């Protein structure tokens, strides 16, 4: 099974990747991107009018929408609605769904403090009373004068914590209230698996496409691939004793004398004698103790001759030869 693999790739370090990535995402398709941004700007009065009807507005589409939501919520809408009702403008409570550390307790503790504490609602705070406390919020809000006092934003609604099911139903009861406007965005292709006709009854979602093919700068940070071990032990050797460099150099030679697999490895006895030959290893214990340091940071393997072999590729070890060992 001769497969080309990501290990057999010309790799790129940390500062080299992120800088040339920053060059593309700020200079690749710049002119048509704001050219799209001016086209969709005329839809902004249409969103203002429908949002008076308490409609949970939901934005789908390819690409990141994070920049677009923050322009649309903060600068455009939130002072426009305060001027049209008649003083600080309408409070914006974003929810970063790409941040996995969102819970149901903490954000709702913000909500009841963002909303009015007209009564002693801490008396009803008791043991899951969250649905209980919001139910007492809802029926009171059915008989209030209709005006928006809060707009909340939920970025990346299919996020790693917001897509949890006890959190989803929590947002469902918020959306039936007329005083708050719910402007959220998702990115998943299976996002309408999240809602049944029970929740969408509470939601009354409407949909709009926004596809600007954004790079998702902030949304790439928490995510990881093998760019983010061959690269792990690449830094430990840069800070050690000078003898460990030499005893790894003698290790890496005869382990690449023969991918870097088990079969190219060496027996412990002769390697003790080999590192006794260059006046390096005194005995087995002095060898093994500064070999456990290569073991503790998982920089070498052993299987069974008593074969110690390096788990990095054929291409990687000669890169480890000519750069850091030399």
């Amino acid at each position: 099974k001769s497969r080309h693999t990501m290990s057999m790739a010309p790799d790129v370090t940390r500062e080299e990747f992120s800088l040339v990535s920053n060059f593309f995402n700020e200079n690749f398709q710049k002119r048509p991107r704001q050219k799209l941004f001016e086209i969709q700007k005329k839809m902004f009065p249409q969103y203002w009018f429908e949002l008076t009807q308490g409609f949970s507005l939901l934005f789908y589409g390819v690409g990141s929408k994070r920049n677009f939501l923050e322009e649309f919520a903060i600068d455009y809408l939130s002072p426009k609605i305060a001027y049209s009702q008649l003083v600080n403008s309408i409070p914006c409570l974003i929810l970063n769904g790409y941040n996995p550390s969102c819970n149901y307790r903490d954000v709702f503790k913000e909500i009841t403090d963002l909303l009015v504490p007209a009564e002693l609602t801490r008396s009803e705070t008791k043991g899951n009373h969250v649905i209980l406390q919001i139910q007492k919020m809802i029926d009171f809000y059915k008989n209030q004068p209709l005006d928006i006092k809060l707009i909340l934003v939920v970025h990346n609604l299919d996020g790693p914590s917001i897509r949890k099911n006890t959190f989803q139903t929590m947002l469902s009861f918020l959306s039936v209230i007329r005083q708050i406007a719910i402007v959220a965005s998702t990115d998943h292709i299976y996002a309408p698996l999240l809602w049944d006709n029970m929740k969408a009854q509470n939601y009354n979602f409407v949909f709009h496409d926004i596809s600007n093919f954004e790079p998702s700068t902030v949304e790439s940070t928490f995510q990881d691939v093998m760019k983010m071990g061959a690269e792990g032990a690449k830094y430990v050797l840069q800070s050690l004793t000078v003898n460990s460099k030499k005893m790894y150099k003698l290790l890496i030679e005869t382990q690449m004398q023969n991918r870097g697999t088990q079969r190219t490895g060496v027996e412990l006895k002769l390697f003790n004698h080999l590192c006794a030959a260059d006046f390096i290893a005194s005995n087995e214990i002095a060898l093994r103790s500064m070999l456990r340091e290569f073991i503790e940071h998982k920089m070498a393997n052993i299987t069974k001759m008593e074969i110690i072999w390096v788990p990095y590729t054929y291409a990687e070890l000669e890169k480890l030869l000519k750069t850091v060992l030399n």
């Binding site: 299919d158 790693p160 897509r163 949890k164 099911n165 299976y190 809602w195 049944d196 969408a200």
Partner: protein, 135 residues
């Protein structure tokens, strides 16, 4: 005599769900016997009736759903609506815990309806199912 030969302890529903959700159920029962080695041949666009049901994944439904529906349909928003409607009915449930099943991690699905309620609901939408079950 009439009471002495009947139990009278049971206080067969034609099910409430809609038409596209009805075909959504009729495709989910297909992977109680239809393995991936055979299904794509016998359902071209060109017995475990007793046994416990196998495990789904996502989009194998819409693989079979698009085939067996009367190009006549393409919008799948209401099709995605009736899935978690069927999840609340506990007729198709998750293999794992009931939490993260949305975002496509490793999540396997399965029916929990016996054969007879499938058989009535096949004829309730005039669809024939006993042909495609072949020992």
């Amino acid at each position: 005599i009439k009471l002495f030969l009947s139990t009278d302890d049971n206080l067969s529903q034609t099910y409430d769900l809609s038409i596209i959700s009805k075909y959504l159920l009729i495709a989910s029962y297909i992977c109680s016997y239809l393995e991936p080695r055979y299904d794509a041949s016998i359902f071209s666009r060109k017995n475990p009736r007793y046994l416990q049901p196998s495990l789904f994944a996502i989009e194998r439904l819409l693989a079979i759903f698009q085939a067996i529906f009367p190009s006549l349909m393409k919008a799948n928003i209401e099709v995605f609506q009736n899935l978690s409607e069927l999840h609340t009915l506990k007729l198709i449930a998750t293999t794992m815990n009931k939490n993260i099943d949305y975002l496509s991690p490793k999540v396997r699905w399965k029916v929990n309806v016996p054969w007879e309620i499938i058989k009535e609901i096949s004829e309730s939408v005039h669809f024939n199912i006993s042909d495609y079950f072949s020992d």
